[PDB]
Every structure is written in structure tokens, then in C-alpha cells.
Symmetry: D3
Subunit: 321 residues, 6 copies
């Protein structure tokens, strides 16, 4: 290591501009060796073959990591970095090339073992398509306890399971039907006009899901909408899990989601909401789904996703709990 250091101008492959006065996430993220996980740590779930649509979401964990590593870790509103020590990257959950059901078991088992072995781990999950939310939440629910889910989404995601299988749109029907979480502990934020079916809306109502449309959010405001509903739900639950489906964002702000359309959230609105929720007690995890780098302009949507990570971390650093 001094054999190589005698070459002052020789650096490892892929190095970028180094500024000694800068601290970027890349300076704070370490590959995880077995060591004890305290707090937030990243994990990738590159599953996208379950998608109804043709999807490149299996590439998102790579591109979101890249956007994240290239961001400054410094918050001017905190007067400090959002990671105090270091942030582990646990790796990627192995995904079966072929069998989607096998892939889901990989996810549930790894997540379960991980949560149990390291009870202080708060997952930062990089999807992957929407279907992963079944396995991740089930692991939270069956390792942590009664869990509330805050689902940012244009869609209910309660699709019937027999037509496609564990498809993109089925995670929450699977969760509700199997009683992994309760309908009234589910807060859906951003449900969008013309993004849903009559039947599926009915199915979420039967189950007492808390539905907040874009229409409601626009008149009442996102943060006030959450203050109005979150307290009630927290009172019936032990933990909260934040599921961010990036297609809740307006197509102009997230062109890289498979299901794009007008009438959605703007990113700064989302970032603020995530930071708010992240400060609340017993936040068990956050996942980001439905980013598709092959559909993106440059990597705008992966950058937007990375900022969701930064603002969640910010919220956690800020929380009293």
C-alpha cells in the first residue's frame, strides 16, 4: 500500500474530482461487513420482472445509489451532515432471474433475518418495482409489531392476484387479505383521478383504507393532510413504515416512472412530507419504488429519489426519538 502510494498520481479506477473541503455521501457510505447495524442502512432490491409493464426498475438501486453518493451530505438547515457516523450499504437482495415467487421469498427471508439480527436497523430500501412492498412490509410487521403504512401513490395497488400473479399492482391486496397489516392503518396519499378502477377503490373502502386523493391534498395541503390523519393512526400502531412510489409525482417531476401522467405531486412537496414523517416516533423503514432509469431523462428521477433519502435521513437526525 506504500508500493502503490509511491505513485502520487495513481488513483483507483473510476475516481472522481476530490475536494478536501467537501463531504459527499460517497465519503460516508461503506460496504457492510458483518458489523452491528445502528440506525439507517441502505439495501437494494432489484426486482422488476413482476411488473405488468416492461420495467427497468431492477437498475434503479444502482442509479439511486449513484445519485445519492454524488450529493453533498451537508444540510444547511441542520448545520451538519445528515449522517453523523457512517451509513452502511448492506448489499442487494439476490433476485431470481426466472421465478418471481422465489424472488419474493428471498426478500422476506433476508429482511426478516436482518431485522431480527440487528434490531436497531432502520431500512432504507431501494426498489425495484412496486411488488416488493409485500415482502418488505411483511418482514417489518412480523419482526417489529403492529405497523402503520404511509403509502405515497397515484394508485391503490390492490389488484387481484390471479390474472398476473404477484404482479406490480397486488402488494396491498396481498397484505390486506392476509391480515399482515390492517386497512385502517394504511394511509394512501396522492390517489389520482383517472389512475384507478371502480372495483379497486371499492375494495380499499371495504377494508377501511384511509384514502387521500390529489384533489383533497391540493385543497387541504399535503402536510396538513398528514397531520390530520397520522396522529389517529399512530395511536393504533407501534411502528410506521414509509412506502414511496415515485409515480405519485407528476410526470414533469418524475419522467422516469413507468406509469406517468399529469396531476401529481411536485418533488419539493414530497421531500417536505417525507422529512416530516421521518421525525415521528418509531419510523421502522422507508422504501422507494417504481423508478425506471431506462425511461428517465438523464437521471432526474433517480436524483429525486436520492433526495427523498436525504430528506428522510434529515428527518431522522432531527427526531427526538
Amino acid at each position: 500500500s506504500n508500493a502503490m502510494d509511491k505513485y502520487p498520481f495513481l488513483r483507483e479506477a473510476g475516481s472522481s474530482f476530490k475536494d478536501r473541503d467537501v463531504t459527499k455521501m460517497s465519503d460516508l457510505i461503506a460496504t457492510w461487513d458483518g458489523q452491528d447495524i445502528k440506525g439507517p442502512a441502505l439495501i437494494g432490491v432489484p426486482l422488476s420482472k413482476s411488473s405488468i409493464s416492461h420495467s427497468g426498475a431492477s437498475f434503479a438501486p444502482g442509479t439511486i445509489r449513484q445519485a445519492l453518493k454524488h450529493s453533498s451530505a451537508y444540510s444547511a438547515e441542520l448545520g451538519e451532515h445528515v449522517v453523523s457516523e457512517l451509513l452502511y450499504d448492506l448489499g442487494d437482495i439476490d433476485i431470481h432471474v426466472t421465478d418471481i415467487v422465489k424472488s419474493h421469498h428471498h426478500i422476506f427471508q433476508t429482511m426478516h433475518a436482518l431485522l431480527s439480527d440487528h434490531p436497531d436497523w432502520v431500512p432504507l430500501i431501494l426498489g425495484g418495482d412496486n411488488s416488493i412492498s409485500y415482502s418488505t412490509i411483511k418482514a417489518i410487521a412480523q419482526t417489529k409489531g403492529t405497523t402503520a403504512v404511509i403509502q405515497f401513490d397515484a394508485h391503490h395497488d390492490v389488484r387481484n392476484t390471479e390474472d398476473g400473479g404477484p404482479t406490480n399492482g397486488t402488494p396491498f391486496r396481498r397484505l390486506l387479505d392476509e391480515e399482515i397489516i390492517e386497512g385502517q392503518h394504511l394511509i394512501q396519499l396522492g390517489i389520482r383521478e383517472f389512475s384507478n378502477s371502480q372495483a379497486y377503490e371499492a375494495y380499499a373502502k371495504k377494508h377501511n383504507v384511509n384514502i387521500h386523493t390529489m384533489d383533497m391534498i391540493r385543497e387541504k395541503g399535503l402536510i396538513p393532510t398528514i397531520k390530520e390523519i397520522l396522529p389517529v393512526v399512530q395511536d393504533k400502531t407501534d411502528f410506521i413504515f414509509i412506502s414511496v412510489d415515485m409515480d405519485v409525482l407528476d410526470q414533469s417531476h418524475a419522467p422516469g416512472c413507468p406509469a406517468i401522467g399529469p396531476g401529481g405531486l411536485y418533488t419539493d412537496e414530497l421531500l417536505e412530507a417525507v422529512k416530516y414523517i421521518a421525525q415521528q416516533p418509531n419510523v421502522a423503514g422507508i422504501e422507494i419504488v417504481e423508478v425506471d432509469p431506462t425511461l428517465d431523462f438523464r437521471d432526474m428521477t433517480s436524483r429525486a429519489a436520492a433526495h427523498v433519502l436525504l430528506h428522510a435521513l434529515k428527518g431522522m437526525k432531527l427526531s427526538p426519538f
Copy 2:
């Protein structure tokens, strides 16, 4: 029985989903009651090199993949079915021919089927001359609500019947009156002094982005529409997609900063489409060859969905 053999190109079907594709039928000559689609694939009329002739296909595709279900209404925006009447035959070479095809086809259909409410898919802005002429001349005295960053009153000497000229022709030819023309979204730096002069000189109701941003789009509409509404028999909605901010409609030939945002436009269209005697709506200046993915075609599909929503709402 070839249970696993399927029609070419067919995809995921879901019993619990009702998409527009489930409700749109190829027209077979049956009587037309209410909204029906018609394509107008003309774009050589354009001053700018334009692929707007492909818009009818892309907008159809985006519309067909959308849910027909409205949550605000608790019902689908189309009760029974929605005929797609086809495309107007556009000549390869002669643009004046193409305008005759449009007017004469529109005229015969409005005539044969007095309950047809046209949902017109352009095509570039030049088509408005012939679509509105057919409306005025079959339905009577007509008010036009023109969402546009531009006046569209260019001269005809320099380039023939270009996409820039349709409202000059319409005004000069007294087929509509200026005072029944409502222009929403007229944008600073998008227009010409002499052309604005022409519009004022005809008493066009001009509402700029400045006024809309101050007053708000619907309130701006609620102030002038009632007026024009009571001195006309019918209203027609001309939506030029370049009224939208470039960030929201990246696929229009004439993009720039400082336009309407989509949810804003969508609300305004539903509000107008609720009014009595809406004779039709057309969508122009979508160019899928300039678009990102099909963002701007999806925005146009949603303009239609919201128009349909407003029409479903009207009886109440």
C-alpha cells in the same frame, strides 16, 4: 381450442379494470349520440417542421390505456360506448385539398348526426379553420374558447393556409365574430404587435398569462364566458397544447417558459365542458416526434378525459 393462443398484440387484461380501450368502438355507421372521436392527421400546414400528423395515433393510444373511471364522480366518464369515427383523409401533397376534405367531412357528419359531439384529434393548428367553420355552419352562432399562447391571426400571403392563420381566416370571413372569441393564455414574447392589433381591432376577448396568473384561470373564465355565452347558440373548445408550459408539454413545436400547468388546464376544460351547448372540442399542436416518451399525448388524453367528465356532469 388454442386456449393459450391470443390475438396479435393483445396484452394483460383485468376483469376489474375498465379502460377506455374497453369502451371505444370502431364506428360502423350507427347513429352517433354524444361524444365521438375523429382524427385529423394534418401537419404539412405547419410553418415549423412538424410530426403533428402522428398525434391522432399517439393520443388514441394514450387515451385507450387510461382508466375510464372518475373518482370524483364515482362512475365512468363514458356510460355505454364511445365511437371512434376514423381519420379524415389527408392528401400527401395538396394542403388546400386537405382542408376541403376536413370541412366537407365534418360538415356531412354534423349534418347526418345532429347529436354528435366532436372530440377532434389534430393535427396542427391550421385544422381549426375547417372544424370551426363546419360547427358554425351546421350548429349556428358559435363562441370559441381558444387556449393558446398565440393569437393565431397570421397573414395568408406568405405561406398559404399555414397553422398560424386559422383565426384570421375565420374572422375575415365573418364565420365567427371577434367578440365571441375567447383567448386564454396569450403569452408575453409569444406574439406580434400588428397581430395583437388585428385581434384588438376585432374585439377579441384577450386574457393573457399575466391576467390569468393574477386572477386565476377559472375565475377569469367565470367572468367572460357568461357574457359571450348569452349572445351565442353554441360553444366550441379549441385546445392548443402549446398554451402549456414547456415543462408540462415538451412535445409542442412552439415551446417556452411561462405557460399554464396541466392540472390547471384540465380543471378549466371540465368546467367549460359542463356548460350547456358544448358543440365540441379539438386538441392541436401535439407533436409526438418532439415529445419525451409520450408525455404530451398523455396530457392531451387527459384533456379529453376531463372534457368527458364535464359532459357526464352537465345534466346535474
Copy 3:
């Protein structure tokens, strides 16, 4: 004929009609169960089976469109390459999520069609490589001892378990549906393969012809020399065209691109030449991915593969 009164109103999306032109679109008919004589298109939009990300499930759509837009007229023939009509049977339903199921559907469907329509010569539009196992098994078990001509840079004999895009010919050989000595691999490319898989191939006595041999002997010369010998030992031949046999410059839309492949005119000629031979039971085209393509170049290449297949068939002295 109620629309005739609207002389300028046409069907949605119908374009420039030229009266003196006959395109494939004019001759391809949506199939409605009628008895099938000769060539008929069928789509197999499976691409999830791909090791790498693949929009191959879209190729049947884009190859269809490129075919339809091509003229049906061959000047070397002085006639259209199809006379009456060419049925399009449709697409094999593939499960969105279950891939074993999808391969069972493909086999079941192909088998039922080949049984019920003995004069059907399948023009199969993939879809990725893995469909070859299901399509060829149907052929061998319904038509009989079958020789395979696979154009390909890769042996496609990858392990079936440990990690299935590059497995079809291992499954094929292992289950003895086909004999290695009846397998002719054309275009196998330097640095596209693994010692183990080549050994597996040489172990089953497959006829391997590398790009080096083909560039030395010439492609047609190579074929004339090996093909008749294999026909002597078999009852049918099946043409499997993996488009990645083509140089990246000629087929940019294949997942596995690299330099040193065949050129498209060189492959078209060879396909025409094979398609005149006795008892051609079918042809398939795999590994076209419209999402990786420039414009639709590779779909156009594939569509021309079909045209030259049809052309050879109409030329066949049998």
C-alpha cells in the same frame, strides 16, 4: 358500405394507399381457424426469461410492422413471395410472472397447431432465445427426426439449474429431443463462448462452424458442404435464427452485440438457400429487442429474413 357516403373518412391510422403497390400488409390476414396451408406467422412475446434486461417481448410487434410495410414483390422471382394470403395466427399467451408456465403454453400451443394443421410451416417471431426449446420440441415430436440449423454467435448450451436465456440447446440435447450430430451451429464467434459450453457441444458431436471457418470458406459454401449430409440423417430441418449472429453494426438491437458477426445480406442469402431445401418444417427469429434498437433496423433485418425465407420456399424444387 354505409361509410361510402363519407368519401374522405378512413379507418383510424390508415395511410397512403398506392393502387399499383402490393405490400405484405395487403396479404397478411388475421387468422380465423381456417385450415392452414404453408407459412403462417405466430408471435412468442417472451423476454422475461432473458438473463439480461430485454424488451424482446416487443419484437413480434415491431417485426410485424416492418414486414407489413415491405413490398411482397420479389424481382428475382418475377412474382410476390406469397400468392393468396399469409395467416397471422396471433401471439402465444405468456404468463406475466410464471415462466415455466409460459414455456408449457408455448409447447402445448405449438404442438396443437402442428398436429391439427399438418401443412403449417411456422414463421415464429420471438421473443428471446429460450423459446427455442419449446418450439423445436413441438416440431420434433410432431414432425419427426429433426435437424436444426441455428445461426448464432453463442452455443446456447448454458447450465439449466445453478443460474435460462442461453439454455435451450442443453435442455434440447439432454432430453434427446434432438441429436447433436443433427445440430448445425453457424456463426459461432471468437470470445462469445466458454470452454465448458464448447466442450459440452463438441461432446455431443454438434457441427460447429465458427466465424473464422465461415470467413475462410464462405457461408453458402459452408452450408452446401454440411447441410445435405445432415439431411441424409434426418426427416426435417428447422431454421433457428438468433439475430445476434449479426455484426453489431448490422443488428444494433440485439442484447448481445459485439464486432465480428455476419452481415445481413450474407444471412439473407443463406436463409433463402436453406429455405429451398426439402422438408423445411419452420423458421424462428430470436433476440431482437426493439428497446435497444436504432430506429427499427433490426426488426427490418428480421422482417427481411422472413421475406427471404418465403422466397426460398417458393423457389424450392420440392
Copy 4:
């Protein structure tokens, strides 16, 4: 200037030891034109398929200008004096029939006023060939046309008007040129219609397919047919339609497919022909920059002109 570091907007790296075509090309000032001179014909609405070939004169100029003028083979510049750029022909945005007269009138007067001008014509779609060839024929005399092309281009005129597919039917039917004086190089399998092929044979057109060419070599087939046609004509005109090239070599043509010419083949052929007595002009058609990869096809077209200039320099 008194500002050593101030240059004209958009200046490029200047290398004193290098001479690019940009250093030799000069906008026409009205002087007498002796030898080759560029003229642009930015017309593409006449195209059957949607086409941006009207941008090609610009993109081809740009690629030509950025090239070296020096031929290592000649040991001199393919033009060491100057090469005028006559400008562009005015294209009506709407009326293509009118646009064709513009082209014919302009070429005819330029040709009549400057008998030593050899046009280097930059299209534009293949439809300009009627008007350019008519001007050469009715100005120079009996003209052989060497038409590099995948297609016969003898489409009937009724369907689309004078589209880019009709030019040689118009020429032959109106007796502007004789069939036996038309040499078609590169006619490609599956690119043509029965009726159109038969039309060509009826007029005794000299048809050389890609198959014949791949069997004999392009130059040998040229050495075999050319002397016959020269024996019965006074002038040669070269019409290069870039879709004669394989799609992998000319991605930017509207009609691409496999099995065409390779660019080096074409370049050698064009230089060989340009060496002959009485080459009256060359045109390049069907370059579409909006469909190209980078500007490959416009670069290929720029080299076609460079190799023509080279051959004209080489002629005894």
C-alpha cells in the same frame, strides 16, 4: 482589431496549416460561375413518408465545410480556387406544385445564364429530380441519368401528387429523357412493385439490381453499361439517392433496409463517373438529419460531393 481575442460569433478552432472546405466555399456574389457550385433545395413535404430532408442542405453543408479539401490521392485540393454556394431555392411552405416551378425556373435561368456551372445539388427529397433534370435536359441537350437508388421511382402521380416517388415517371412520360438513357444502379429486392418494374422495362430503362451488382462489382457493371449510354447522349447527370446505401451505412434515410451499397463502393463509383466527359451535374437526395445517427448520413453525402469534385478534377 484592437481586440485580438474577439472573434466572430461561432468561430471554430483555426489551424493555419489546415485548409478545410469552409476556407474555400464562398457565398455567391454574382460573379460568373465556372465549374461546380453548390445549390440547396430544402423541399421535403413532397415526401410520401414524414421527412426532414428539408434540413439536409444545412446539415450536408456543415459536414462538407468541416472536411479537409485535400486529396492525398490527387496530391492537391479538390478545389484550390473557390467553390461558390449559390444559396437555397425558395420553397413555398404550402404549395409543392409551385415549389417545383420555383426549382425548375431557377435552375433553367442559372443554367442558361452561366453555361459553365456544374450544379452540385443538395436535396431535399427525391421529388426534386423532375425539376432539376428537366432544367439540365432543356438547357444542355440529350442527357443520360445515372440514378443510384433502391427504388425505381416511377410511382403513378394520381395518388399523392408529385411526391418523391414519382419523378422518373414524370420525366419519362413527358419525354424529358428516354428510358434507354436512364441507368438505375442498386435496385433492391423487396423495395419495388411489380407494376412499377414493368413500367420501367416498357420504357427500356437500364436496370441493375443489387444482385447483379454484387455478382459483377459496381465498377465493372458501370464500365459495361456506361459507354453504351454515352454513345447516345451528350451529357451525364448523377442523381445519388442515399437510400441506395445499406441501412448500417446510411441510417438517416427515410427508407432504410438491409442489402444495399456500402459507402466506399458508392464513393468510388461516383468519382469514376465524375471523371467522364460532359458530366453536367450531381444531386444528392433523401438525406434526413432528423432520422440520422449523429450526422453520419450527412457526412456520407458530403464525401459523395468530395469524390465527385475529385473525379471532375481528374478528367482529361
Copy 5:
């Protein structure tokens, strides 16, 4: 004339009733500069990120030229007589330091020989701001700077030389301007470093974050800090780094992210500031046309220029 349908290479549709910037802008002759004039600075090798900002002066020019000169809200054109285009500053292919010297020397001389010249500067990356501002300050007087930016741009100069992230360190360290005359609008959460924010604070820079701006408003925020700084200075100079805009509004900047200004906000603010007395100039940096969608960001930049032109015209 003699050839009626022959026009200059590349000429566009001319319309007689429309005055676009391209009719007003004139390639500079050397005559005395009265008022605003354009000058290009095609430098981007000084950027940390791989950047094509050297193409922006051309793309922004192109966008500007195709824009209407007519301001509806003004009832007149923002330019009255003509607007000179001074040309481009010579940028060395290889030596980034030499390029900065060229910029300062050229700029210094022009502002000395033409005391009435108001620079409309088209970059180029942010690194130019040192040479441009220093030139204003050392030729004009005590200078106030309004920096629209998501970043402080006070990076240390040791790690990479005079890169695009350093200009305000160089400016402050050398006391070319005082920190308390530096107004930073749009400083963005997560776009900056602790040590760099401290350097800015140590120097008493006026820092306004996106957060603060979102609370008070952009125009209010300005009306409140500007008067104070104008007391202490003789001129204000406007530095617009386009990456101050949200990524959805300016996709063509190297450093894109969410949470930025919207183009309409920015345009209003530029207009406001440009009304003030003693505006010595404006520069636009960090537009990268090779990263853009179409030329949206170049159009956005063209429009900034128009709202500043508009602003200057409406003050005595």
C-alpha cells in the same frame, strides 16, 4: 431580380408583420456601442463536471433570434433600433488560465472604449464570473452582484485550479468585491458544503436560501435586500446561473436536482432588478445544450435576456 426564387443558404420563412430578435440583432461593425450588446464566452473545460456549456452561446443566440421582440405588456419591442452582437471571446483549445486572461482583457478593453456598453453575456460555465465581474469592477466602480445560484461557488482553488465552482472565492479573496455586496439567491438545501457556507458567512455574504425564498417570496426578498446594497455601491451586475432553476424547468444544466426556482419566478425577478438604476450588465451561465431536452434551457435563457431587456427599457 434576375433569380426571384433564389435566397441565402439557410434562410427561413420570412413574415412581414412579425419582428423577431433576428431582425434587430446585428453582427458588430466596431461602431460606438450604445446600450446592451451581446458577447459570447464559449468556455466549459473549466467545469468540474463534463460540460458542453461552450455550445450555449450559439444555442441561446439561436433561441433568442427566433423569439418575438415584442413585449405585449410594454406595447413595444424591448429593443428599439438594433442590438449588436459583439461576437465570441477567443477560447484557447487547451489552456484554461489563458482563456480567463482573454476574457478579462477583452472585457476590460470593451468597457473602456465603450462606456455606454451594457454587457449581455452568454457563457459558458460559471468560471467566467471572475473575469467578467473583475472587469466590471475594475472599469466601472464599486460593484454589487446579484448571484442567482443553487451553489455558493466559493470552492478552494488548489484542488482543481480556477474551475467553475471557484469564481466567488477568487473575487472575494482578492477583494474585487465585498461579501456584503454579494447577494446569493436560491442557495439550495443539499447543494453546498459546511466549510463553503462558512467561508461565505465569514465574508458577510447576503445568503438567501430556497427555504427563505419560498417563505417570503423572490420579489419581496429582493425589494428588501437590494436597496441596502445599492447604497454602498455604484453599479449592480446580475449573475444568472441557470442551475438555480428546478431540474424540471432547466434539464440542461450539469448540476440538476429538485427544489429550485421556477422559470416564471426567475423571469419576473430579472425584470425587476433590470429596472433599477446602474445595472452594469447581466451574464447567463451553466446552460449545457448537450444535456438539454430539445433546447428548453437555452429558450429559458433566451427569455431571461428578454425580461432583462424589457426591464432596462422601462426605467429612466
Copy 6:
């Protein structure tokens, strides 16, 4: 860590036990002693006359190489048997081109000196790097013949734009770092060059073979006749591959694309033949620009150029 059987390291695709990719063979250099070929990137492109992203090519080429089989069927063995060290990238200054060149020369000179058995596999970077790379070779190893595959002479004067990608063989020749007659230029292309530079090169007696000559005689025979003559006046050979030597259809990601170039087929075969010769001191690949490419076609061709080079070395006495 093995505790979680379905957890793997970030970015891990699936591995086939029976496949051997260059990825299974390439290791980050820990300082150990270099025996044979080793990779090294030179991410420099600001020195390019045209706007150039060739600074990204070391990454994209490395990715393409790593994903390629190492197995040569024609050889019946892998082209690497041991391992292949990736030394890393030489640090390129964001701003100072001349300092960056010094960095390259000095890292290069230092490395070749401390590891006598290193055969550099260099990844450009634009062509301006050749000056510092070849100088390091010449002054570290001895008299060197240079075979440059190139459409252009690259003898541009240095005064107009400084040490650009156009100037490396001017600098090399002017400073008598090599002799003209030791430079073999393969692929020099019609209309790609200027009268004055062709003259410079001829004045220096450089061996010039145009595409025309090559198309007439064949690339390999052309080489077979001039190469021994130069090996005769030379102790080592260095292979300089500028990829714009390739036809645009085959290498669309090179800043300078035009028709009438070499095809990758011929180039591959030529590099392998040359790399078979005694005393091949190294190879560099320059002028691939990933930002201009279609997919990564041109980086893939570069990766194959490297594969065939190793194959030649593997195959040499």
C-alpha cells in the same frame, strides 16, 4: 456475511460457475509485482480539439471488457491464465492539461521502471496521451517502433491549440523521442488530412499506408512487408490504436467519424498478429467517446481489441 445466503454485494449480477469472464480475472492492484499485461486508464479528453467525452472511455471500456468471455476458442484456452491487474487511473487535473500530461509521463516512467515486466494495456482518453505514454516507453525500454492505426497523421502544430489530441506525433518526432521511419501509420484516410501535415510526416520518412493502399494489398499483407523492416531498426514495438481508424458504421462513438474506414474484423486480426511479435512493449486505445456512442458499441470494439491483443501475446514466443 455468509450468514445471509440471499444477500449479495451491491451491483452483483448473477454468476455462472461454468463461465469465465474477464471480471473473474481482473484484480485491483495492491502494489504487488507486475508480470505481463496490466490495465491502466488515462481519463483525459479536455485536450481534444472537438468537444470530447473520451475521459469516460476508461470506465465504459473497462465495463465492456469485464463482461466479455476470456476464452479464445481459436486458442483452446483463456487469454489470461493468471490474473490481470488493474493498476488504476492516472490522476488527471480538472484544469491543467500540461500538468496532466506530466502526471501521465511520470506515472508511466515510474511504473515501467519499477516493474520491468509490465506490458501496459492503456485506456484513453483522447489521442494527446500518446506523447507521454510513448515517451515513457521509449526512455524506459529503449528504441521503439510505433504502429499507429489512424485515419489521421496527428502531426498538427502545437502553437494553435497547445498539446491537443492532434499534436502527439509532432511532439514525439520534433523532440526526437522516436524516428519517423520507426512510425508505421496504418489507415491514413482520404480527405481526413491536410497537405502540410502529410508533408511533415513524409519529411520525417514516416511509413504511411493509406486506406487505398490497404484496400489494394490487404491489411495483414501490408503489415507483413513493412513490419520486419522496422523491427530491424528497433528494440521494442508499441501499438497505438486510434479507433477513428474504423469506419463510422463500425465505430460511431469516435469524435471524428467518416465513411471509408477499416472494419473491426480487419483491425482485430491485425492487432492480434502484431501482438504476436517479439518485444511488444504495450498497447493503447484512444479516441473512444461513450457520450457520442450508440449503446456502447465502440467501447465493446475497444474491449475486443484488447482481447485480441492479449490473445496474440498469449500466442507469442
